[PDB]
Amino acid sequence: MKIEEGKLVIWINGDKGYNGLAEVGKKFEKDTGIKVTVEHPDKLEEKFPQVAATGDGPDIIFWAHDRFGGYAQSGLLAEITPAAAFQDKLYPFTWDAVRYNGKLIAYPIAVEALSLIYNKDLLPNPPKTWEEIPALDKELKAKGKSALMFNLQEPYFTWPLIAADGGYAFKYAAGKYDIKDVGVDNAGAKAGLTFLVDLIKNKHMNADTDYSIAEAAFNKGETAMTINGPWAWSNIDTSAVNYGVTVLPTFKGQPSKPFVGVLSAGINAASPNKELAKEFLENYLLTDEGLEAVNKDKPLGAVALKSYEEELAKDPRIAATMENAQKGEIMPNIPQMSAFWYAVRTAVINAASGRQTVDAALAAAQTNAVDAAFVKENHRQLQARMGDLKGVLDDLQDNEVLTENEKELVEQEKTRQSKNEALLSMVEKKGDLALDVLFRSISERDPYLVSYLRQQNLAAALE
Numbered sequence: 001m002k003i004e005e006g007k008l009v010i011w012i013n014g015d016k017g018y019n020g021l022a023e024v025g026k027k028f029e030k031d032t033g034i035k036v037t038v039e040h041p042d043k044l045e046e047k048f049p050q051v052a053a054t055g056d057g058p059d060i061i062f063w064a065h066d067r068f069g070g071y072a073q074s075g076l077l078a079e080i081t082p083a084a085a086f087q088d089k090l091y092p093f094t095w096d097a098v099r100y101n102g103k104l105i106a107y108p109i110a111v112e113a114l115s116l117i118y119n120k121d122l123l124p125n126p127p128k129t130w131e132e133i134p135a136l137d138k139e140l141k142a143k144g145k146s147a148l149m150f151n152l153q154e155p156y157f158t159w160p161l162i163a164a165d166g167g168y169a170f171k172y173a174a175g176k177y178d179i180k181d182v183g184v185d186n187a188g189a190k191a192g193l194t195f196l197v198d199l200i201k202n203k204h205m206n207a208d209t210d211y212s213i214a215e216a217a218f219n220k221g222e223t224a225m226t227i228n229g230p231w232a233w234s235n236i237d238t239s240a241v242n243y244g245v246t247v248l249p250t251f252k253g254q255p256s257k258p259f260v261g262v263l264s265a266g267i268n269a270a271s272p273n274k275e276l277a278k279e280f281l282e283n284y285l286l287t288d289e290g291l292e293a294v295n296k297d298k299p300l301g302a303v304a305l306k307s308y309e310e311e312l313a314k315d316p317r318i319a320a321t322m323e324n325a326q327k328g329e330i331m332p333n334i335p336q337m338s339a340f341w342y343a344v345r346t347a348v349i350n351a352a353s354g355r356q357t358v359d360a361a362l363a364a365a366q367t368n369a370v371d372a373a374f375v376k377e378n379h380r381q382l383q384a385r386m387g388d389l390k391g392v393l394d395d396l397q398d399n400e401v402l403t404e405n406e407k408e409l410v411e412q413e414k415t416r417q418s419k420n421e422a423l424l425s426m427v428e429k430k431g432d433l434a435l436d437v438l439f440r441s442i443s444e445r446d447p448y449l450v451s452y453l454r455q456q457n458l459a460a461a462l463e
């Protein structure tokens with residue numbers, strides 16, 4: 001519809017303390033009279049750039065910083081204006097994570113990193129290595145219990161192992177990232193994922209495992225270990241299970257390298273309540289009591305606010321979190337991250353399910369990760385061989401990449417070539433997120449064509 005003036009609508013992920021944040025809104029409402037509504041829509045990281053592109057959506061959006069460059073590229077975010085004194089209340093490295101092209105485009109909240117969570121009354125000495133987990137799983141299964149269960153559907157949770165022996169997203173080149181240098185196909189990436197797959201072949205893990213299965217199994221005492229972030233600590237607490245949080249196990253003598261996310265709050269560019277949002281985030285949320293209100297619901301973990309993090313220092317769970325973070329990497333915020341994640345999500349699920357080899361799964365990821373480049377570079381061949389656009393046009397429209405008028409202009413053309421030509425040029429101008437949708441649509445609806453071009457480009461590169 002349109003964004004209501006004199007009100008604040010907030011979006012935050014369903015695994016965060018959204019009831020706690022709503023408590024902060026109530027305090028803001030009591031003092032200022034401004035209503036604050038907190039929501040947690042399914043797949044909000046996808047849903048946001050769809051609705052915001054038309055000038056709809058929440059006043060404030062919460063997500064890890066890695067998606068925020070894509071949003072900023074599309075002009076969905078407003079530039080924020082905290083004073084120098086405000087900025088000093090937070091760690092410098094958290095401001096860096098929310099800087100896109102010299103502009104601050106979000107307020108940092110929480111520093112998120114995965115850790116190894118273990119049942120104390122079942123495993124006094126957690127294994128320091130991934131290697132000894134197969135042996136640990138055989139002797140644990142004799143007692144009707146398993147060694148390790150964690151979410152295998154989201155690449156976030158498998159990435160630490162994949163990166164440990166040398167897998168990386170985009171190569172950092174002394175100041176910036178090179179979007180042509182992807183490291184999902186190297187030997188370290190292959191070896192980390194091959195280990196994961198081998199765990200499954202040897203039936204120490206199952207490819208079907210998601211968040212729901214992994215969480216219930218641990219909190220029932222059915223599995224010895226899991227891998228998760230701080231937000232999951234509440235559900236383990238209430239289950240009265242005695243558990244510890246510690247450094248992730250090593251792979252080949254190298255530490256697991258989790259991708260660190262800075263949970264951040266961006267303000268919709270189309271919002272008429274930017275000042276209200278600033279007041280809410282600076283004066284109310286980013287205070288000791290505001291952060292604790294959220295934490296009571298779901299733990300934030302380590303946080304960006306200096307004064308609050310010092311009080312969290314005495315917590316061994318927080319220390320384990322920052323240790324794990326410091327052995328990992330802060331995620332890039334570049335627009336190509338969405339394509340990176342899609343590429344790794346697909347590679348893991350396919351290798352783990354057995355429908356691709358690790359080599360074939362990762363070979364494709366290398367190409368899927370560089371979405372936009374692939375389409376522009378194969379512009380000539382696509383124009384000729386793409387074919388019927390109905391499903392693709394629908395995809396682009398469902399995802400709000402094209403308007404109705406734009407779709408109909410493509411459908412106007414007399415032949416398939418002129419139709420293809422019209423569509424191709426229009427999408428390239430709309431950003432990385434739009435070409436992702438186009439690439440994914442073509443990959444989903446005509447998978448052969450992508451494989452074919454992938455293969456024709458090899459013969460062109462060989463000669």
Ligand SMILES: OC[C@H]1O[C@H](O[C@H]2[C@H](O)[C@@H](O)[C@@H](O)O[C@@H]2CO)[C@H](O)[C@@H](O)[C@@H]1O
Binds near residue numbers: 063064112156263341
């Ligand atoms: O699995 C890919 C996924 O990883 C990260 O998502 C995290 C998120 O940062 C956390 O705040 C938490 O909610 O769990 C999510 C994992 O399911 C990336 O931030 C995200 O963009 C990416 O798609």
